[PDB]
Amino acid sequence: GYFKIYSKHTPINLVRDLPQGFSALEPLVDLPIGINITRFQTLL
Amino acid sequence: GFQPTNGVGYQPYRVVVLSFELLHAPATVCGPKKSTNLVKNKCVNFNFNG
Numbered sequence: 065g066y067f068k069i070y071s072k073h074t075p076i077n078l079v080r081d082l083p084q085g086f087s088a089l090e091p092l093v094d095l096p097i098g099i100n101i102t103r104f105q106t107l108l
Numbered sequence: 109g110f111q112p113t114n115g116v117g118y119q120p121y122r123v124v125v126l127s128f129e130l131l132h133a134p135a136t137v138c139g140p141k142k143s144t145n146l147v148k149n150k151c152v153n154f155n156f157n158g
């Protein structure tokens with residue numbers, strides 16, 4: 065019933081790839097929506 | 109049939125009714141919790157956020 069989000073930001077200067085490295089993500093927020101999620105879409 | 113000349117009983121009353129429900133969703137409202145002052149350098153029982 066809680067929906068949780070995590071995130072991180074970093075600079076990169078590399079093309080068509082995910083750069084090799086290591087990182088960990090801090091918690092950001094959660095929401096008590098309690099709505100089962102089956103699909104999602106991204107907007108640009 | 110209200111009129112300004114009225115007695116004890118024949119008066120207009122406002123009524124507000126509250127109601128609540130239970131669900132499997134998380135809770136959203138609750139009453140607040142009291143809290144003691146803090147003593148230091150002593151042997152005591154403690155309760156911090158449960």
Ligand SMILES: *[C@@H]1O[C@H](CO)[C@@H](O)[C@H](O)[C@H]1NC(C)=O
Binds near residue numbers: 098099100
């Ligand atoms: C979660 O899925 C169940 C399927 O049994 C459905 O009844 C319920 O409505 C769904 N939750 C929400 C918030 O729609």
